[PDB]
Amino acid sequence: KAKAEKVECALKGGIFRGTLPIDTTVTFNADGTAQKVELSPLTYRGTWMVREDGIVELSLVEKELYELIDSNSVRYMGAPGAEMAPFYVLKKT
Amino acid sequence: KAKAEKVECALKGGIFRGTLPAGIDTTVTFNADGTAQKVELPLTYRGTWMVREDGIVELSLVSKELYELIDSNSVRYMGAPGAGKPSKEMAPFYVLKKT
């Protein structure tokens, strides 16, 4: 439970930006909802959930996983069931 | 609700230190399981903590104490219930920094 609620605390209210292999934004609202923006701004809305292993499930509108590197960074891991990791990082803004 | 959660997050797993007026070198640890301890100069205390809807932290020691979260790394000893310390010029001396 410790890991999960630590990830929860670090993310909610936070907006994370980075250019993935497309300038991308991911906002984890504290109400449990989420927003993703891509650049011709494409927009995706939905909710985010945290497992007990720490991973963050994002269901927009099929699932996007996210890992919390540190308090201010998050890595896009791709869909569930999936040395250039730094290019998938999203820094808090 | 939204306020208390931020206060919860910023605190749990955190150990805060400061020299409160007498000055007493003091430690307060907010364990993430809801428990807590205080160390003074070594007088050790033990108990629990929680956050109200106003954002204030109640601390029940054994061997009540109110705390305000200034920033993500600082808390201020306010006093006891019904016995707050609103003195501005005196406020900085009641602060406890995280580490």
Q: To what resolution in angstroms was this structure determined?
A: 2.4
Residue B80 in 3-state DSSP? Answer: strand
For residues B2 and B54, give the distance between their C-alpha atoms in angstroms, rounded to a whole number. Answer: 10
Cβ atoms within 10 Å of A7's Cβ, excluding its own? 22
For B20, half-sphere exposure in the C-beta direction (CA atoms, 13 angstrom radius) is 19
Query: Chain A within 8 Å of B34 (Cβ-Cβ)?
Result: no
Residue of A nearest to B8 (CA): A9
For residues A72 and B47, give the distance between their C-alpha atoms in angstroms, rounded to a whole number. Answer: 32
For residues B4 and A81, give the distance between their C-alpha atoms in angstroms, rounded to a whole number. Answer: 36
How buried is B2 (Cβ within 10 angstroms: 0-12 exposed, 13-18 middle, 19+ buried)? exposed
Residues of A within 8 A of B10 (CB-CB) are 9
Task: Give the start-to-end residue ranges of the domains of chain A.
Answer: 1-93
CB A76 within 8 A of CB A86: no
For residues B20 and B90, give the distance between their C-alpha atoms in angstroms, rounded to a whole number. Answer: 10
> Which residue is listed with tokens 């907006």?
A15
Query: How distant is the Cα of A9 from the closest Cα of chain B, in angstroms?
Result: 6
For residues B16 and B9, give the distance between their C-alpha atoms in angstroms, rounded to a whole number. Answer: 14
For B77, half-sphere exposure in the C-beta direction (CA atoms, 13 angstrom radius) is 21
Residue A8 in 3-state DSSP? Answer: helix
A72 Cα distance to chain centroid: 11
If we measure between CA atoms, which residue out of B92, B99, B87, B98 comes closest to residue B20?
B92
Q: What are phi and psi of A49, to 5 degrees?
A: -140, 150
| Nearest-10 crossing angle of helices A2-11, B2-11 | 120
Experimental technique: X-ray
Q: Which fold, B1-99?
A: Lipocalin (2.40.128)
Q: What angle do CA B36, A6, A26 make, to 5 degrees?
A: 150
Q: Does domain A1-93 have CATH number 2.40.128.640?
A: yes
For residues A31 and A48, give the distance between their C-alpha atoms in angstroms, rounded to a whole number. Answer: 10
Give the CA distances from residue B85 to residues A6, A8, B18, B65, B68, in Å, rounded to whole numbers and listed in that order: 32, 33, 17, 12, 11
